[PDB]
Design a protein around this ligand. Structure first.
Ligand SMILES: CC1(C)[C@@H](O[C@H]2O[C@H](CO)[C@@H](O)[C@H](O)[C@@H]2O)CC[C@]2(C)[C@H]3C(=O)C=C4[C@H]5C[C@@](C)(CNC(=O)NCC6CCOCC6)CC[C@]5(C)CC[C@@]4(C)[C@]3(C)CC[C@@H]12
Ligand SMILES: [Mg+2]
Length: 546
């Protein structure tokens, strides 16, 4: 019968209960028990805290009014107050001490995944403190995981007045019988019970989740760790920068702080960072996920020379210039990783830090040319198959769904065959209708299909068709070293970019930091998104934030 779940903020989704600081303060100050509690609610409906919770006055207006109530309550009890006694100090400490109750949030997220309409209903205030930013970030991180956020000070009503419960029901578009409400204050549950809604008194989280488990018939406690938050493309800010007369770069932007530019590889998208973008922004960074030249909404000129590393790096610099960014952290994967290494070698002043996933830094060989080596090692036969313009394009564009369902697979799910050139292509003995890998949903696959409908594989494959050009350019840097903060991350089950091709990188990057991910294939971002986020946020906070 249940179809919606409503969660209180203080003491339910956030701990410790800021309301509970009043008790701990009395004890720590040797004050009469409940003295600070009575000052908080002195007056009831006609009181200052109700005017605060209703939006009639701001928090900074209310602070001097609570102090007066504290002095009038200490008078009737015949007790003096301390000297440094400061309501602002106490509430500042309490608000910043309050953190998200992760197991409770997980239960709500899980209920939303199974089709529940979730919402937050809380008695809160208009925060105009000098430190209001702290609570703003907390509410932002919580907001995105719920369908509705009902704040008392924004609707002019407070719990337990039954009008706010009637307001929640009209917002939910549900009857009381199909709604469960959780709160840490029993008074706030009676009106709800009176309307007939399922109610849960939240004292300890595990017991409440056990009750919620029973009424919903859905496992919420001890459930597996969920994947990090992903992106909905239509919920993102989309940015467009013309770096050149007929070349425009498209990117997705999220968060504030130092700029972090994410560069995907072949044949991918900004969407390949869907599991990193929210996490990195949440960690205190301004994330710019890019559609690399030739991909998605970025321009895809047909000329091969438009995709040599020198031109791509130049354009990334112009991208920073047009955006007003003097520096950015560059994080790349696969071909994007190759791009960021040479960004650090040719434009160090514009690179705050550089990190690569899977892609090692191998200095060019001034003797042998890349075309000689790709033939001297038949393992790179597919790169020879990619050379002839139009050939690989036809195979990859023939059935886009089949293409990405065949490529985006874990290391235990390989469905592709062998030498590619003299076989006929990449999909010669390959399923025409491959099964769905466990790393991706059918919807995520269809997003890639729709992106690559715009320009096809000409631009992306052109990245492979400047071997000699890039080699001559790279040889100009053979005397340099990378001395800015750098991070290399290797994946064990990556068979195209094996972790041993990175073993000599310290020769050219002495202070290079490393990270390793076990049981991880080539598509690192979606294979092990949780581990990637930890390795990157740890390195950013230690080497990029300064
Ligand atoms: C021969 C094997 C099987 C492999 O051989 C090992 O395979 C097993 C390992 O356990 C053992 O059984 C075996 O004995 C041996 O050890 C070597 C790699 C391999 C030959 C492999 C490859 O190289 C590339 C790709 C893929 C490459 C990507 C993901 C694009 N990314 C890159 O271009 N990145 C390198 C550049 C980035 C940085 O800038 C410069 C370099 C696009 C899709 C696809 C073409 C899709 C097809 C594959 C998976 C491809 C052709 C499939 C075939 C396979
Ligand atoms: Mg509460």
């Amino acid at each position: 019968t249940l179809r919606a779940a409503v969660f209180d903020l203080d003491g339910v989704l956030a701990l410790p209960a800021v309301f509970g600081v009043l008790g701990r303060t009395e004890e720590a100050l040797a004050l009469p028990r409940g003295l600070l509690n009575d000052a908080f609610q002195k007056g009831g409906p006609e009181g200052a805290t109700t005017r605060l919770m209703k939006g009639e006055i701001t928090l900074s207006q209310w602070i001097p009014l609570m102090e007066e109530n504290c002095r009038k309550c200490s008078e009737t009890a015949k007790v003096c107050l301390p000297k440094n006694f400061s309501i602002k100090e106490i509430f500042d400490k309490a608000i910043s001490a309050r953190k998200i109750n992760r197991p409770m949030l997980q239960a709500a997220l899980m209920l939303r995944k199974k089709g529940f309409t979730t919402a937050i209903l809380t008695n809160t205030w208009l925060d105009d403190r000098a430190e209001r930013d702290g609570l703003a970030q907390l509410m932002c991180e919580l907001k995105m995981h719920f369908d509705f956020l009902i704040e008392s000070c924004q609707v002019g009503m407070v719990k337990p007045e039954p009008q706010i419960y009637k307001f929640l029901l009209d917002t939910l578009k549900a009857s009381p019988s199909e709604v469960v409400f959780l709160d840490d204050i029993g008074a706030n549950l009676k009106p709800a019970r009176d309307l007939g809604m399922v109610t849960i008194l939240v004292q300890d989280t595990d017991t409440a989740l056990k009750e919620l488990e029973k009424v919903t018939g859905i496992q919420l406690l001890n459930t597996p760790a969920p994947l990090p938050t992903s992106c909905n493309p239509s919920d993102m800010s989309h940015g467009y920068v013309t770096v050149k007369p007929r070349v425009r770069l498209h990117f997705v932007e999220l968060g504030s702080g130092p700029a972090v530019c994410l560069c995907h590889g072949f044949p991918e998208s900004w969407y390949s960072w869907r599991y990193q973008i929210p996490a990195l922004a949440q960690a205190g960074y301004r994330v710019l996920a890019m559609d690399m030249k030739g991909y998605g909404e970025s321009s895809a000129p047909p000329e091969i020379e438009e995709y040599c590393m020198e031109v791509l790096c130049k354009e990334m610099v112009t991208f920073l210039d047009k955006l007003g960014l003097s520096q950015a952290v560059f994080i790349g994967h696969d071909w994007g990783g190759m791009l960021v290494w040479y960004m650090a070698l040719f434009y160090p002043e514009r690179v705050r830090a550089v990190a690569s996933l899977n892609t090692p830094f191998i200095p060019a060989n001034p003797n042998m040319s890349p075309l000689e080596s790709i033939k001297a090692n038949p393992v790179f036969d597919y790169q020879l198959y990619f050379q002839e313009p139009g050939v690989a394009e036809a195979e990859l564009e023939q059935n886009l769904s089949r293409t990405f369902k065949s490529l985006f697979r874990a290391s235990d799910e390989s469905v592709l065959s062998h030498k590619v050139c003299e076989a006929g292509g990449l999909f010669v003995n390959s399923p025409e209708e491959p099964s769905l890998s466990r790393m991706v949903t059918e919807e995520e696959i269809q997003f890639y299909v729709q992106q690559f409908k715009k320009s096809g594989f000409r631009g992306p494959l052109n990245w492979y068709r400047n071997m000699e050009r890039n080699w001559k350019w790279a040889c100009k840097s053979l005397g340099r070293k990378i001395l800015i903060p750098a991070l290399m991350v290797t994946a064990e089950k990556d068979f195209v970019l094996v972790p041993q091709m990175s073993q000599h990188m310290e020769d050219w990057i002495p202070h290079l930091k490393r990270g390793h991910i076990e049981d991880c294939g080539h598509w690192t971002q979606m294979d092990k998104p949780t581990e990637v986020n930890q390795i990157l946020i740890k390195w950013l906070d230690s080497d990029a934030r300064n």
